[PDB]
Amino acid sequence: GSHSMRYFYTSVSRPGRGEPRFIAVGYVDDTQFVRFDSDAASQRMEPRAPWIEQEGPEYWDQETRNVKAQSQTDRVDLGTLRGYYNQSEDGSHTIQIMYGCDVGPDGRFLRGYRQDAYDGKDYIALNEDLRSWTAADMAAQITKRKWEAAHAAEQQRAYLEGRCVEWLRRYLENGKETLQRTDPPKTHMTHHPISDHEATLRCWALGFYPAEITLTWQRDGEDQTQDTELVETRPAGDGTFQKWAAVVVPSGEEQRYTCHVQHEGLPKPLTLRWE
Amino acid sequence: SALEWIKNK
Amino acid sequence: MIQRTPKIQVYSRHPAENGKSNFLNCYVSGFHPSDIEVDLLKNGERIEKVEHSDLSFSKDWSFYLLYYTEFTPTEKDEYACRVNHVTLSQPKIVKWDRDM
Ligand SMILES: [Mg+2]
């Protein structure tokens, strides 16, 4: 099916004190493969996948240079954005940058993206056309005009619809055993009495990949939204994910309720009921 | 492969 | 300037069975800024040699981290996770429940 390569950069200025803390993380779907920390002893691009450990020593040194250049540019960017927003020098600020390409079931390019942020909120984005920019405010408009004059939108489209897809197709072949997997969830129901006239019904789903899963509670096939608690898809730490949906039911009415589990790895969605 | 052409803002 | 409160989750890697080795997880999500102090507790005392994942974010730029340590659950022993962030007034602790 579809696939996605992604990069996440986080440049935080230490107010007390040092070089701006820089974390670079690389993913292929919901799987990490590269790592770069500024406070690390290595000072190199580090592998976090078995199919990337088989890459030449010339590769690991090129990645280190590009990521080091990206960090030092972000180091001065923090010092330029403090002027655009007329903020103090004794403040900690964050520059979160994300970009990536998409590959369809066929193999060819589908979506190209770049989203940049400052202090939680959005800053500048690269559109679906990959030729125009989207500034969040009047301060970010200066960055848009600077990137339009330098014709930086062409360097982005070159790296997104080419090379990114050329290396993502290479990554999907080098790791055709690790990434092409669709682990279906291992579901189960638990029942805990909360009151002398009401009880909680928890529906589990463990060991699934990819993280995208739908846990839906129903009462007579009718989607139960009220009296429902849902937790965010959590990592297992072994390359799989976990999720649960709980529902508060009147005691004796356990049988009326039903939990539906939808996932890529399952051929037909599950239906769990209490006995 | 990371972005090789980094632009100053 | 925008700031978000961390969402904590305390769970084990596999379904907890007393005596068999596992991994205690503490997944902190939806927080901003990035600077956060996360601890894992065994009967009130800190667990030394605790590893964590690399800092990444979500759709709303919210940060997430997984703090993990190898452990052996027993009926007597109680586990928890101590989290400290700039948004919070006091460090909040969430105990580990074998079904949560
Ligand atoms: Mg994102």
Residue numbers in the entry:
A (entry chain A): 1 to 275
B (entry chain C): 1 to 9
C (entry chain B): 0 to 99
Paper quotes:
The HLA-A*11:01 allele is a member of the HLA-A*03 supertype and is prominent in many Asian and Oceanian populations, including Indigenous populations who are a high-risk group for severe disease with influenza virus infection. CD8+ T cells recognize peptides presented on HLA class I (HLA-I) molecules and can form long-lasting memory after being primed by an immunogenic epitope. Whilst HLA-A*11:01 favours peptides possessing Val, Ser and Thr at P2 and basic (Arg and Lys) residues at the C-terminus, HLA-A*02:01 favours those possessing Leu and Met at P2 and hydrophobic (Val and Leu) residues at the C-terminus. Structures comprising of HLA-A*11:01 in complex with the IBV peptides NP511-520, M141-49 and NS1186-195 were solved at a resolution of 2.08, 2.95 and 1.82 Å, respectively.
The 9-mer M141-49 peptide also adopted a canonical conformation within the cleft of HLA-A*11:01. The M141-49 peptide contains anchor residues at P2-Ala and P9-Lys as well as secondary anchor residues P3-Leu and P6-Ile. Similar to the NP511-520 peptide, the P9-Lys of the M141-49 is buried in the F pocket of HLA-A*11:01, forming a salt bridge with Asp77 instead of Asp116, and interacts with the hydrophobic patch formed by Ile95, Ile97 and Leu81. Although the backbone of the M141-49 peptide aligned with the one observed for NP511-520 peptide, there are four solvent exposed residues (P4-Glu, P5-Trp, P7-Lys and P8-Asn) in the M141-49 peptide, which therefore represent a larger surface accessible for TCR recognition. Structural overlay of the bound NP511-520 and M141-49 peptides, with an average root mean square deviation (r.m.s.d.) of 1.52 Å, showed that despite sharing a similar backbone conformation, the overall peptide conformations are different due to the exposed side chains. The antigen binding cleft of HLA-A*11:01 for both structures adopted a similar conformation with an average r.m.s.d. of 0.45 Å. Re-stimulation of PBMCs with individual IBV-derived peptides demonstrated that peptides in pool 1 did not produce robust CD8+ T cell responses, while M141-49 from pool 2 was the only peptide to elicit significantly higher IFN-γ+CD8+ T cell frequencies than the DMSO negative control. CD8+ T cells stimulated with M141-49 and NS1186-195 were found to have significantly higher proportions of polyfunctionality when compared to the negative control. The conservation of IBV peptides was 99.9% for M141-49 and NS1186-195 and 90.7% for NP511-520 across all IBVs from both the Yamagata and Victoria lineages detected from 1936–2019.
